[PDB]
């Protein structure tokens, strides 16, 4: 995920939505540690024109083995995921999950994902009162070549489940 301005929360706007609506904003910083020692770091930045978002995302990866699934195009899909949010302070979301892809040889390819979302203005009291918040994340990717991509996503926030 990377445009959480499209994510509503269970009972109201997500903090991402509120920060767009009030024109105060947030920034995103991530570190991703892959099982084969490679890592990716990212910085996501946004500007806005009303209901239109402009993203500038810098993504840097190093240490991927030349014969591994990333450099040899063996990843087949991103597993559905549950992302955990806690709020260590009123301006910061710490987002974590274990990220896994399926691969062509049947093994999963694993990564430990960490993210901070840093807000210019405090998040609302009603956000801060419900922790942890979990997000179910489904994605799809098509690409016929390594040149053009078509991506889709569906996310659902939840703090509870029953049965």
């Amino acid at each position: 995920y990377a445009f959480n301005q499209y994510l509503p929360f269970p009972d109201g706007m997500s903090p991402f939505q509120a920060a767009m609506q009030d024109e105060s904003g947030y920034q995103v910083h991530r570190t991703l540690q892959y099982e084969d020692g490679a890592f990716v770091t990212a910085n996501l930045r946004y500007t806005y024109e009303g209901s239109h978002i402009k993203g500038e995302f810098q993504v840097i990866g190093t240490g991927f083995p030349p014969d591994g699934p990333v450099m040899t195009n063996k990843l087949t899909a991103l597993d559905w995921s549950v992302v955990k949010f806690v709020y260590p302070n009123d301006k910061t979301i710490l987002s974590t999950f274990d990220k896994t892809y399926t691969t062509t040889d049947g093994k999963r390819y694993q990564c430990t994902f960490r993210e901070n979302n840093t807000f210019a203005k405090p998040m609302a009291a009603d956000i801060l009162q419900k922790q942890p918040m979990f997000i179910f994340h489904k994605t799809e990717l098509q690409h016929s070549n390594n040149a053009e991509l078509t991506f889709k996503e569906k996310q659902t926030a939840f703090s509870d489940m029953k049965s």
Binding site: Y1, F3, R30, H52, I60, V70, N146, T156
Partner: protein, 57 residues
Amino acid sequence: PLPKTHELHIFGSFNGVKFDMVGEGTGNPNEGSEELKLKSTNGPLKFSPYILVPHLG
């Protein structure tokens, strides 16, 4: 307002080799649904496009 449309410039490097893509998309901020199309502004990516997926929206 809540968002309806977006554009993205995603760039950086993998294993020391630069990449750069641009594109645009839409979403439903009441449903958490989004879609995006992206194209390289150079040649094909030298790495799996799936490595970018978590940084797309």
